[PDB]
Amino acid sequence: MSSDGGPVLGGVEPVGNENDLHLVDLARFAVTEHNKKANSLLEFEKLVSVKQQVVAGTLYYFTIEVKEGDAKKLYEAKVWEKPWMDFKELQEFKPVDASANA
Numbered sequence: 001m002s003s004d005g006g007p008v009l010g011g012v013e014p015v016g017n018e019n020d021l022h023l024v025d026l027a028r029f030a031v032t033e034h035n036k037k038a039n040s041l042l043e044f045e046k047l048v049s050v051k052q053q054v055v056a057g058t059l060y061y062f063t064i065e066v067k068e069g070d071a072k073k074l075y076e077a078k079v080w081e082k083p084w085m086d087f088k089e090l091q092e093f094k095p096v097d098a099s100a101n102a
Helices: 023-037
Strands: 013-015 042-054 060-070 073-081 092-094
Touching: 023 042, 023 060, 023 073, 023 092, 042 073
Parallel strands: none
Antiparallel strands: 013 042, 042 060, 060 073, 073 092
């Protein structure tokens, strides 16, 4: 006995458990989509975790790791899907190699 209101009450929530086929789909999708317009470049190894943010839709910060060429690191796969209209579109899945501040 325990239930009241949706399992949502905030934003930026940590998650993971590849057990969620959907979650992985996003990360695995990124590498794919990317390999499409990039004719491939790296080799996805697996998924570490994934977050979720609420805004103009449904955002998820996937933190997977892939071995690029002769290297290995983690790429932040960010996807934006919409249930109200069952949609989705890869935003970018990379460790974001850039440093700035203003």
